[PDB]
Design a protein around this ligand. Structure first.
Ligand SMILES: CCCCCCCCCCCCCCCCCC(=O)OC[C@H](COP(=O)([O-])OCC(O)COP(=O)([O-])OC[C@@H](COC(=O)CCCCCCCCCCCCCCCCC)OC(=O)CCCCCCCCCCCCCCCCC)OC(=O)CCCCCCCCCCCCCCCCC
Ligand SMILES: CCCCCCCCCCCCCCCCCC(=O)OC[C@H](COP(=O)([O-])OCC(O)COP(=O)([O-])OC[C@@H](COC(=O)CCCCCCCCCCCCCCCCC)OC(=O)CCCCCCCCCCCCCCCCC)OC(=O)CCCCCCCCCCCCCCCCC
Ligand SMILES: CCCCCCCCCCCCCCCCCC(=O)OC[C@H](COP(=O)([O-])OCC(O)COP(=O)([O-])OC[C@@H](COC(=O)CCCCCCCCCCCCCCCCC)OC(=O)CCCCCCCCCCCCCCCCC)OC(=O)CCCCCCCCCCCCCCCCC
Ligand SMILES: CCCCCCCCCCCCCCCCCC(=O)OC[C@H](COP(=O)([O-])OCC[N+](C)(C)C)OC(=O)CCCCCCCCCCCCCCCCC
Ligand SMILES: CCCCCCCCCCCCCCCCC[C@@H](O)O[C@H](CO[C@H](O)CCCCCCCCCCCCCCC)COP(=O)(O)OCC[N+](C)(C)C
Ligand SMILES: CCCCCCCC/C=C\CCCCCCCC(=O)OC[C@H](COP(=O)(O)OCCN)OC(=O)CCCCCCC/C=C/CCCCCCCC
Ligand SMILES: CCCCCCCC/C=C\CCCCCCCC(=O)OC[C@H](COP(=O)(O)OCCN)OC(=O)CCCCCCC/C=C\CCCCCCCC
Ligand SMILES: CCCCCCCC/C=C\CCCCCCCC(=O)OC[C@H](COP(=O)(O)OCCN)OC(=O)CCCCCCC/C=C\CCCCCCCC
Ligand SMILES: CCCCCCCCCCCCCCCCCC(=O)OC[C@H](COP(=O)(O)OCCN)OC(=O)CCCCCCCCCCCCCCCCC
Lengths: 603, 56, 459, 99, 174
């Protein structure tokens, strides 16, 4: 046998191993975080090997190892799809998870349940690998709901915090609407194609219809926090910073984009769903960047950046470029994870402070995190030869050179400018200027765990784009010929965003005070979407649940119709029958009437 | 003493002997339904040299 | 089936002859042994049923239900011995006698091969349940709950007796095999409509159908813990088993008569989930969740396709296990604080961690989390409903969202937050309670490992 | 007061008399043996033995038999050029339609 | 491998190109394949040799059950319960075999899609038509019988199909 299947399954299995050891003296000791981190490192190397095997000859396989059950003519089995997407995303996810686990070993040092934290991180990684490698819709759904519930558990890490509990339930609610879409798609595919596996689905759906493709689009919007279903992702910043860095921003929110990428044959066949995907992505990226440019919480700014980048990926899928979307998934994983880790380092060094209004002077106070965050923000905005150039620049070129929605193209360009803008805001308000933090300076970023984790994710944010771009096969025809101004569109809008944001931020020093604008209030309060749409529909649903269902119907009218009315009638008739004075005159007269009636009316 | 244990734990044989009696009654019920034994069109065959019935 | 029936009737004299302090030990051990023996019924056939004799037979639909009944008896013994410490020996033995009689009636109900013997046993299950509720319930409302339960069931089931004797006079037999092989189409006439109504209404009341369900919150809230466990896990499934069995003789009239019941089931599924969202009582929340799941099972039986029956069987077994476990968890909380209000006891995760884990697992199974058999059954029903019509997906998705909402609401309310300050008697969880939860939850995941054992005869 | 009634008793705690109690009985020895029999029989016997018994139940549902029969039918029919799935379940010669 | 029948489960001959390196740089894939063969493949092959040696000392055989044909529901008289029972069991077994035939054809289709890869739309046209034919026949036979399907119901369905076809043929010949 070739080592491809063995090594892929080995990576997955050795990921599962430390969960088995979560009932041992090692789980009772303080070596468990280091044990889990070492396991993830070894899994990362063993995943690097089949990536080299694919990068040579483009080797892909499917492994239907275990047969689960046969529903007459439908066979469900445990099958894994080890193709380009899986063998590229597994090493990236493992690398990011390894760095995040080391940073969490430093960051969650005082947590009484750090071992449980690491077990939960490993469980999320397992579910995400199941999602990515799944070859059938049922196993994909297992991974889907697994990452959803692990996100729920990790957001509500501090159970005494009411805000944390509301954020966890909110994430569940939005992902559950997404799951409504997912289940609609599963039912359609089984009913009309007799299969839940991608091979038969692709073979039988020569032209996929609107109903299954819109089901998939709705599920992806829910899982990837697109507009309409977006507010849960910024609200998921209640959990510990390692959770925000690993789960949401880098590896879990890309689940919807990955779902849409995995069905790119059907997506190619359809066109209306492509238009809907493009428009949804465009409005998501614009709206979330616009909300980001004015937030004062660093984690919130990074979360809205994540939503904006996901919108960009959804735009890329909508222009019939699924492989560019996957490339952006990988590059964004790298630099967004690093940005979240730097934000967490700043938060920890300033006594759990997350307000850029109280950060300041950190350029010189914290050298290594300063340079790491600068490199990450440059890579995010598309510096000409960093890891974000090889995906975002090509995405912008493809959007400009396609038969696209004009409004979608305009919103995409404006969103690129706003990306530069809010990256400028983070840097300007956190690192430049005079200090604003309380006078007891506890700044210390000299821990080897923190430095090494950021260093590993920092090398990737510089060179990994070049390596990956030059080692993957050409899966799309390039845009070789285009106007020079259209070639330089991304750089021009990025620099314009930098300059305008810098001017606006420098204006803050003037001794001039002006009341805020309506546009400022709209952007700062998230477009008023969480207020209106978290107070009105919830209030009406919870009011109907009691006034109409519980009280009016169950306690009042369903009780009155059958059992209350019947009981009342029987009681009244009983009173009528038994209310007799016991007078022989009366009931003998009754006997006489009965005898006459029987003689006359019976023949 | 030993007598008290039997005096106290004689009730632990009731369910086992009930299981044995139920198995016996199941066999008795089976032996009254032997009207098509070796007579179904699908399973009718010749008797082996040293067997009297196909099933009990 | 006698090898399983006789050991129960021998549990009776053993219970009455054992010493005063060995009743719980003897009953639990020998119930476990009888459950192990009943595990042998799962070796079913692909063509026909296991025709033991003229009186009893077993199928892929009966066998999991029998295994669930036999497994549920020792768990009920454990919970009962929790809450019946101060009782006299005679009354403890009477309680165990009621439980054993209920198990015997349920076994003979699932294995009865005639519709009339099935009717006699399925109506005989009412007496032990009513006695248990109205005698060993705690509150005043146990009497009214027993009245509601009894009279709802009997009003449903008496026209069923009339219809069964009428069908015996018409066709000569009530044997299930004969009525399956000699079935004829039911013509569209008023007489046939009312025959259909008699049968289906009996089992719809037993299910319960939405609008015929008030007896369920009344009885499940006011019964003792063993009564609650058997009412939700097994007694609700007599309706599903009966509806699956009796619809052999009701075609093609089921195609036209199922619209009101499907509409009631789908809309009432939505309505009972929404009720669960706003319940101030924990036991009532679990009861209304039971109503929603049984509404889904009714939809499956009424649409009546090979994929819907498998989902119905899987969902019935899964709901039995999950609802029994949820009732046990709520009962442990009640035995701590002596109140059923949901917001009275909070912070139970920081007071009792392992019970918090049990709550998490039970609530994760209550909502359909893959690959649990709860999800398997729900998904098969949803797929069959999608083939029936394409807006059933809308109603089903709404129901799944609300189910997740109220399940996690219950978990967050009871376990998370900060503990009530003045409740200073939350003693550490007992080994008995922990073992009860483990024995509830491990079989569910093993059934996930082997799912063909609970998918019914249509598999 | 309208009756001569007992006061409501205080709740009894099993850990006060027996700190290492399993919650089964007031008597320590009976409590210990109740725990032991429940754990042994239930977990060990029923869980382990019933799970392995169900895992190794003989294939009486004829899944593998049906697969081998289908393989033989497919091999024979594709060898001879016959359609793999017959168009009719029954023999139209045996069926007699009304005029 | 003699484990399965190559006629039932066909695979095209595997054309693997020979390596044609053009660089002096060593091949990490080749080095790692050599390491894998040294560390993993040899121990697992030795273990399997030991186990297979132990198996060959305890050789024993199991057989495939053979069912003879019995008269079907068309030949069974009305309310003749024994012949009806035998015919119903036979029809159920045939239903199972047909389900497994459809499963085999679906396995062929899936394997061909994955094997052909980027040119599956043209290279898997033979398997797609075979699946179409098998699935259409299976659907026409057992499409809408219901949860309580039976040989009598399938016979009624086939009689209805035959009546419809006869009517269509008469109208065409008119
Ligand atoms: C229903 C409408 C739906 C519209 C949908 C489409 C939406 C498109 C949005 C486009 C971007 C809007 C950006 C501003 C919105 C947020 C404003 C805000 O609160 O900022 C505070 C926020 C700082 O927060 P803070 O420190 O808390 O400040 C609080 C203070 O109290 C300071 O608070 P303040 O409130 O006093 O400051 C705001 C003030 C000052 O801020 C600005 O002026 C922002 C900068 C605007 C730049 C516009 C373009 C300028 C030219 C750019 C270069 C292109 C031209 C060509 C150049 C040469 C090319 C070769 O501006 C205004 O009040 C005027 C309105 C701002 C724009 C409104 C856009 C339309 C929506 C609203 C319509 C109705 C408005 C009515 C008036 C308000 C109510 C009375 O600002 C920033 O961080 C900077 C962000 C803005 C610059 C980003 C980079 C440029 C953006 C893109 C421009 C185009 C580039 C090229 C794209 C590709 C082309 C192909
Ligand atoms: C065989 C075991 C049982 C199986 C039953 C199956 C059905 C059989 C029906 C007829 C049974 C025979 C008659 C028994 C009358 C007992 C009366 C009595 O005093 O009982 C307590 C008495 C001991 O207490 P005690 O010293 O007399 O002190 C009494 C004081 O009241 C103590 O003072 P206290 O204040 O503590 O006691 C108050 C207590 C005192 O109250 C009682 O003791 C009354 C017990 C119920 C009245 C009798 C009903 C008869 C009608 C038929 C239905 C019976 C089902 C329940 C049977 C309970 C059996 C005790 O009353 C209450 O607590 C009120 C509770 C109210 C609700 C529950 C009562 C009604 C339950 C029945 C209705 C449900 C029927 C469902 C439909 C299906 C029916 C099959 O128990 C016994 O003597 C046990 C009898 C059986 C001994 C074992 C016999 C077999 C020996 C081994 C044979 C081996 C065979 C060969 C095997 C192969 C290997 C060798
Ligand atoms: C912590 C672990 C557990 C975790 C789960 C825990 C919860 C569930 C517990 C279980 C619940 C169900 C209970 C079922 C009871 C019945 C058991 C049963 O039916 O077992 C089935 C089955 C047994 O089948 P069978 O029909 O009995 O045998 C068929 C054949 O005849 C067999 O072929 P054979 O004749 O070749 O036999 C090979 C032989 C020998 O094997 C070998 O030779 C293999 C190793 C070769 C090593 C080669 C190198 C050796 C060293 C070098 C030597 C030379 C020197 C060189 C020096 C070099 C120096 C450098 O090994 C065996 O026969 C072993 C059979 C299995 C034994 C274990 C069964 C335990 C049952 C316990 C039940 C207890 C109650 C459970 C419930 C309790 C309540 C919770 O066993 C298994 O399935 C075991 C595992 C299978 C292999 C590993 C598969 C890996 C798959 C990877 C997937 C990755 C996915 C990742 C996804 C997530 C990340 C994305
Ligand atoms: C060709 C034949 C006719 C085809 C018609 C196709 C219609 C497609 C649009 C259907 C939308 C149905 C509503 C679902 C949400 C939008 C989905 C989507 O992507 O639509 C496509 C549209 C864009 O697609 P489009 O409009 O280009 O559609 C294609 C148009 N033709 C047919 C010409 C090709 O998406 C968006 O613009 C994003 C909108 C997201 C809205 C989220 C909810 C916000 C509600 C705000 C108002 C109410 C107050 C707040 C309430 C909040 C929620 C509770
Ligand atoms: C610290 C812990 C960390 C977490 C670890 C647990 C989480 C990991 C779970 C995933 C790993 C699963 C391990 C699977 C090992 C293989 C064994 C399994 O696959 O066998 C199953 C076997 O099924 C199981 O036995 C399920 C039994 C179901 C429970 C039976 C009832 C137990 C009594 C309790 C009564 C409850 C009644 C409830 C209603 C019925 C499935 O069937 P099958 O693989 O092909 O059998 C192989 C044998 N063959 C080849 C001969 C066929
Ligand atoms: C399809 C099924 C139905 C879909 C629509 C359902 C709408 C109603 C959903 C059920 C109502 C909720 C009932 C009770 C839930 C509990 C409410 C609750 O917990 O509070 C709100 C809770 C937390 O409040 P915070 O604002 O975070 O408080 C912060 C603390 N300072 O957050 C929420 O749950 C808000 C949920 C509101 C639902 C409205 C969202 C509906 C959006 C649908 C748009 C779909 C567009 C998708 C595009 C598809 C592309 C093809
Ligand atoms: C553990 C390590 C034990 C150490 C000894 C190593 C054993 C080496 C291999 C020997 C045993 C393996 C073996 O031969 O048995 C295979 C045996 C199946 O036997 P068959 O007769 O082929 O049944 C048909 C299956 N197609 O495989 C198994 O039992 C399962 C083993 C791997 C599967 C793991 C299952 C994961 C559990 C997931 C829970 C359910 C998830 C739902 C699946 C969703 C699918 C859509
Ligand atoms: C038409 C000819 C007769 C056909 C009979 C139809 C079916 C009769 C239903 C049998 C139950 C009703 C019997 C009469 C009940 C009755 O008397 O009502 C008053 C009754 C008096 O109770 P007391 O114990 O005296 O306490 C004093 C309370 N003020 O009020 C109650 O509290 C009874 C409430 C529960 C009654 C039973 C619950 C079920 C009622 C019918 C449900 C089934 C109907 C079908 C749905
Ligand atoms: C004050 C009074 C309050 C009354 C409350 C009643 C609630 C509503 C119950 C029904 C809700 C859905 C109604 C659906 C409906 O009308 O179905 C008609 C159905 C189909 O008939 P049709 O369309 O004519 O078919 C001919 C072929 N094309 O026709 C049929 O299927 C034939 C008739 C079937 C129904 C017979 C009676 C049973 C009614 C449902 C169960 C009642 C008990 C539970 C309801 C709650 C009680 C509290």
């Amino acid at each position: 046998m070739n080592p491809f299947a063995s090594l892929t399954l080995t990576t997955l299995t050795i990921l599962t191993i430390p969960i088995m050891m979560s009932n041992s003296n090692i789980y009772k000791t303080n070596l468990y975080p280091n044990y889990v981190k070492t396991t993830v490192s070894y899994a990362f190397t063993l995943s690097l090997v089949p990536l080299l095997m694919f990068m040579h000859t483009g080797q892909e396989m499917i492994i239907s190892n275990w047969h689960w059950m046969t529903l007459q003519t439908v066979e469900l089995s445990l099958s894994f799809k080890m193709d380009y997407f899986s063998v590229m995303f597994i090493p990236v996810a493992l690398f990011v998870t390894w760095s995040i686990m080391e940073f969490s070993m430093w960051y969650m040092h005082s947590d009484p349940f750090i071992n449980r934290f690491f077990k939960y991180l490993l469980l999320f990684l397992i579910t995400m690998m199941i999602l990515v490698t799944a070859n059938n819709l049922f196993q994909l759904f297992i991974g889907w709901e697994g990452v959803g519930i692990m996100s729920f558990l990790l957001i509500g890490w501090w159970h005494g915090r009411t805000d944390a509990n509301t954020a966890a339930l909110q994430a569940i609610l939005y992902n559950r609407i997404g799951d409504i879409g997912f289940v609609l798609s599963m039912a359609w595919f089984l009913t009309h194609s007799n299969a839940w596996d991608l091979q038969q689905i692709f073979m039988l759906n020569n032209e996929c219809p609107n109903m299954p493709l819109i089901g998939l689009l709705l599920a992806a919007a829910g899982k990837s926090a697109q507009f309409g279903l977006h507010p849960w992702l910024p609200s998921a910043m209640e959990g510990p910073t390692p959770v925000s860095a690993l789960l949401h921003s880098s590896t879990m929110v890309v689940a919807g984009v990955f779902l849409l990428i995995r069905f790119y044959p059907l997506m190619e066949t359809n066109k209306l769903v492509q238009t809907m995907t493009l428009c949804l992505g465009a409005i998501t990226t614009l709206f979330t960047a616009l909300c980001a440019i004015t937030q004062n919480d660093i984690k919130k700014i990074v979360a809205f950046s994540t939503s904006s980048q996901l919108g960009l990926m959804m735009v890329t899928i909508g222009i019939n470029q699924p492989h560019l979307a996957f490339l952006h998934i990988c590059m964004h994983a790298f630099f967004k994870a690093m940005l979240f880790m730097c934000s967490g380092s700043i938060i920890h060094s300033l006594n759990d402070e997350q307000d850029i209004r109280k950060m300041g002077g950190l350029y010189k106070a914290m050298p290594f995190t300063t340079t790491a965050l600068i490199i990450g923000s440059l890579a995010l905005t598309g510096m000409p030869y960093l890891t974000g150039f090889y995906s975002k620049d090509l995405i912008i070129e493809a959007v400009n050179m396609s038969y696209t929605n004009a409004w979608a193209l305009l919103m995409t360009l404006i969103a690129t400018s706003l990306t530069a803008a809010y990256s400028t805001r983070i840097i300007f308000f956190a690192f430049l200027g005079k200090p604003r933090f309380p006078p007891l300076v506890l700044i210390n970023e000299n821990n080897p765990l923190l430095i090494n984790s950021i260093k590993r994710l920092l090398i990737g944010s510089i060179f990994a784009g070049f390596i990956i771009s030059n080692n993957i096969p050409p899966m799309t025809v390039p845009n070789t010929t285009m106007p020079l101004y259209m070639k330089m569109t991304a750089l021009i809008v990025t620099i314009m965003g930098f300059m305008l944001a810098l001017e606006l931020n420098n204006t803050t020093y003037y001794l001039k005070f002006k009341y805020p604008s309506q546009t400022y209030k709209f952007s700062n309060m998230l477009g008023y979407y969480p207020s209106i749409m978290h107070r009105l529909p919830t209030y009406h649903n919870l009011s109907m649940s009691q006034k109409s269902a519980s009280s009016l119907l169950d306690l009042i009218w369903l009780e009155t119709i059958l059992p209350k009315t019947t009981s009342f009638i029987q009681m009244k008739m009983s009173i009528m029958v038994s209310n007799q004075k016991g007078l022989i005159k009366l009931y003998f007269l009754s006997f006489l009437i009965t005898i006459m009636i029987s003689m006359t009316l019976f023949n | 003493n030993v007598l008290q244990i039997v005096r106290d734990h004689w009730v632990h044989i009731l369910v086992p002997v009930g299981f044995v009696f139920g198995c016996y009654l199941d066999r008795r019920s089976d032996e009254k339904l032997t009207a098509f034994r070796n007579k179904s069109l699908l399973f009718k065959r010749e008797l082996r040299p040293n067997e009297e019935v196909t099933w009990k | 089936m006698l090898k399983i029936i006789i050991p129960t009737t021998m549990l009776l004299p053993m219970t009455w002859m054992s010493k005063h302090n060995m009743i719980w030990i003897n009953a639990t051990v020998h119930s476990l042994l009888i459950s192990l023996i009943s595990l042998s019924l799962l070796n079913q056939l692909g063509e026909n049923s296991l025709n033991f004799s003229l009186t009893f037979f077993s199928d892929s639909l009966s066998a999991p239900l029998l295994v669930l009944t036999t497994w549920l008896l020792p768990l009920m013994l454990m919970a009962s011995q929790s809450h019946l410490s101060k009782e006299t020996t005679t009354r403890k033995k009477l309680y165990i006698t009621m439980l054993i009689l209920l198990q015997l009636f349920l076994i003979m109900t699932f294995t009865a091969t005639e519709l009339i013997l099935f009717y006699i046993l399925f109506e005989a299950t009412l007496v032990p349940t009513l006695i248990i509720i109205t005698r060993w319930g705690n509150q005043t409302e146990r009497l009214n709950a027993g009245l509601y339960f009894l009279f709802y069931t009997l009003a449903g089931s008496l026209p069923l007796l009339v219809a069964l004797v009428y069908i015996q006079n018409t066709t000569g037999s009530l044997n299930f095999l004969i009525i399956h092989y000699w079935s004829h189409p039911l013509s569209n006439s008023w007489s046939n409509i009312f025959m259909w109504l008699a049968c289906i209404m009996a089992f719809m009341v037993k299910m319960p159908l939405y609008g015929l369900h008030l007896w369920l919150p009344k009885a499940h809230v006011e019964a003792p813990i063993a009564g609650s466990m058997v009412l939700a896990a097994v007694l609700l499934k007599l309706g599903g088993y009966g509806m699956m069995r009796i619809t052999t003789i009701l075609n093609p009239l089921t195609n036209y008569m199922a619209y009101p019941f499907l509409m009631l089931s789908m809309w009432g599924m939505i309505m009972t989930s929404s009720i669960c969202l706003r319940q101030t009582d924990l036991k009532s929340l679990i009861a209304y969740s039971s109503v929603s799941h049984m509404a889904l099972v009714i939809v499956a039986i009424m649409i009546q396709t090979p994929w819907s029956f498998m989902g119905a069987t899987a969902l019935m077994i899964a709901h039995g296990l999950t609802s029994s476990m949820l009732f046990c968890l709520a009962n442990t909380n009640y035995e701590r604080v002596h109140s059923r209000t949901m917001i009275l006891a909070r912070g139970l995760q920081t007071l009792l961690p392992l019970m918090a884990t049990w709550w998490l697992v039970a609530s994760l199974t209550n909502l359909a989390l893959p690959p649990s058999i709860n999800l398997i059954g729900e998904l098969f029903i949803i797929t069959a409903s999608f083939s029936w019509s394409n807006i059933t997906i809308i109603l089903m998705g709404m129901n799944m969202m609300i189910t997740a909402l109220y399940s996690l609401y219950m978990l967050i309310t009871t376990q998370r937050g900060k503990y009530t300050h003045h409740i200073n008697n939350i003693k550490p969880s007992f080994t008995r309670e922990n073992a009860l939860m483990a024995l509830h939850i491990l079989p569910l995941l093993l059934l996930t490992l082997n799912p063909k054992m609970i998918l019914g005869p249509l598999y | 007061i309208r009756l001569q009634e007992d006061p409501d008793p205080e709740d009894e705690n099993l850990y006060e008399k027996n700190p290492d109690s399993h919650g089964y009985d007031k008597d320590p020895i009976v409590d210990l043996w109740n725990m032991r029999v429940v754990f042994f029989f239930g977990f060990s016997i029923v869980l382990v033995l019933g799970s392995t018994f169900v895992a190794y139940l003989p294939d009486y549902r004829m899944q593998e038999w049906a697969r081998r029969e289908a393989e033989r039918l497919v091999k024979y029919r594709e060898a001879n050029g016959l359609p793999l799935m017959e168009s009719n379940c029954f023999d139209p010669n045996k069926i007699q339609l009304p005029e | 491998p003699d484990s399965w029948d190559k006629d039932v489960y066909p695979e095209p001959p595997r054309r693997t190109p020979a390596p044609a390196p053009q660089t002096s740089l060593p091949n990490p894939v080749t080095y790692l394949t050599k390491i894998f063969d040294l560390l993993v493949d040899r121990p697992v092959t030795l273990a399997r040799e030991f186990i297979e040696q132990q198996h060959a000392k305890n050789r024993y055989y199991y057989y495939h059950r053979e069912f003879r044909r019995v008269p079907d529901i068309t030949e069974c008289e009305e309310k003749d319960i024994l012949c009806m029972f035998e015919a119903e069991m036979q029809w159920r077994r045939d239903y199972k075999v047909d389900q497994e035939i459809v499963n085999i054809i679906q396995e062929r289709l899936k394997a061909c899609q994955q094997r052909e890869g980027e040119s599956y739309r043209q290279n898997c046209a033979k398997e797609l038509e075979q699946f179409t034919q098998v699935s259409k026949a299976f659907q026409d036979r057992y499409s809408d019988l219901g949860a309580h399907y039976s040989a009598r119901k399938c016979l009624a369905k086939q009689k209805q199909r035959m009546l419809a076809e006869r009517k269509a043929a008469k109208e065409a010949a008119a």
